[PDB]
Design goal:
The structure is a homodimer. Chain A has about 300 residues and is an alpha+beta fold. Chain A has 13 helices and five strands. Chain A: Heterodimer with RXR. Interacts with NCOA1. Interacts (via domain NR LBD) with CRY1 and CRY2 in a ligand-dependent manner.
Amino acid sequence: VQGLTEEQRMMIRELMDAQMKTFDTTFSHFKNFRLPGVLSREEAAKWSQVRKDLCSLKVSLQLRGEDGSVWNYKPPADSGGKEIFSLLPHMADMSTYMFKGIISFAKVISYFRDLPIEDQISLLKGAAFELCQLRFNTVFNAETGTWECGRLSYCLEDTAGGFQQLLLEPMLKFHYMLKKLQLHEEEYVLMQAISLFSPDRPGVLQHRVVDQLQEQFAITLKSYIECNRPQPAHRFLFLKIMAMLTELRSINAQHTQRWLRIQDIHPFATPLMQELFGISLTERHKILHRLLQEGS
Amino acid sequence: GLTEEQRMMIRELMDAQMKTFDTTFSHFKNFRLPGVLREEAAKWSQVRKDLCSLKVSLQLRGEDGSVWNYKPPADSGGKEIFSLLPHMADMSTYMFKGIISFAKVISYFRDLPIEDQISLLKGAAFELCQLRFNTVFNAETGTWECGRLSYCLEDTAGGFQQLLLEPMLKFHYMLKKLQLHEEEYVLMQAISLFSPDRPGVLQHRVVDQLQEQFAITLKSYIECNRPQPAHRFLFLKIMAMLTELRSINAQHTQRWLRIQDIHPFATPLMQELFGISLTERHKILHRLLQE
């Protein structure tokens, strides 16, 4: 701590405080979510692409009850029909809940609250998926391929190629790679800040304020790693993290294209997802605007 | 072989079974499911013993190929022990209605006074449901395969021998081992249904003679359609299993009453069948039997 500047210690403290106040790790407040029910050449190419997007990210769901009970949902196998979409309604509700936690996270950060509200909208539109993925990595169990979200657990379905086959999916490789770095909470939340305060997000106007903010978060991260991470296992850690943030932005662009594909074929998005991912600003994004004006 | 009347007797029973036993449970729908989320202490502790003996997991196989599975909670002393009662109450009610319809198509049962029809159904409803459930019981997997629904016995520390301590599980394993035919199952159901010594029966002599005729038909069926020496005492084994079923039925009535007192769960039709003018006390059953 003494190795960091006082401004840098306050920056990590506010980011850590914001994370604790806005990250519902146990999903204890995630309720009323939908669940899978009890039960043309061009169009063929479009469906074929979507079938690969959803098959790569195939998971079973486990719903854990406070009483000790466990509901487990194993997805249908792909027969070429719309059974590939059985879990989309649930994943949209759960993603929307995560996005609302990310929005609250940003609202509590002084540096973000001061910015113009159109930039607050533009930065959240550009980073929502990325910060959600960073938070999901902190609950990812790489031994079991499971995101352990308290009452909800999402387990990757076993495939033919095994581990190697799943690593061909950039989203999954990112989670396995990032988990291997064994990052601290402080390093995760600084990653979130660097991603959030990206000057080159579409629609940003205060490119220069955001860029100066981003640089200070990165400098703080580098300083933290130097004052707390001396082992040879952590050599070049800062640069590794920065490289993973660059990979996360590429995965963010890939996700947007997958989302517009799946939305065209089978609309699944909630109103908040459509605002985040579906591009005057405040008027086109009425939910974000409201949430950003509301209190914490 | 069998007398013509004995063959007709079997044909009417088989007809009733075919018309009223939903073997695939395809018409069992809209059922409730476990949710996402000093003296009184003696009543509670006896109830915990009643529910722990028959712990099952629940599997729902979707038409799309998906599978929902429900592992029950462990007993933490709370009301989680009651998590599956609402579902079982719907399953029991669905089965009981099929048993009621079974008796109604049988000529010998219709010709009885309606109050005897009520008393016989109250006495045998649980037994006929268990006999039907045995036909969907997979003894290799300890699972009742009810169409898209499965109930799978949860593993005990003791193993198979600890389950066999529970009288109803032992019953299903023993009865399955006999490998009875459809006709033998339905004749068991008739013998159980036409029991003259059920509480409330008034035409004891008419019911007794009907039971004897069903039992003679079963005894004759076995002698004529099974290898004589190997199945010499099959009929008596079946009778012994019906005697044990009447004892399990008595135990189940007492368990049901205890659990109902602490944690009301029975449907209106179940309350009538289990004691919660005979017609005035059983107006749902009366309506179902008049239609």
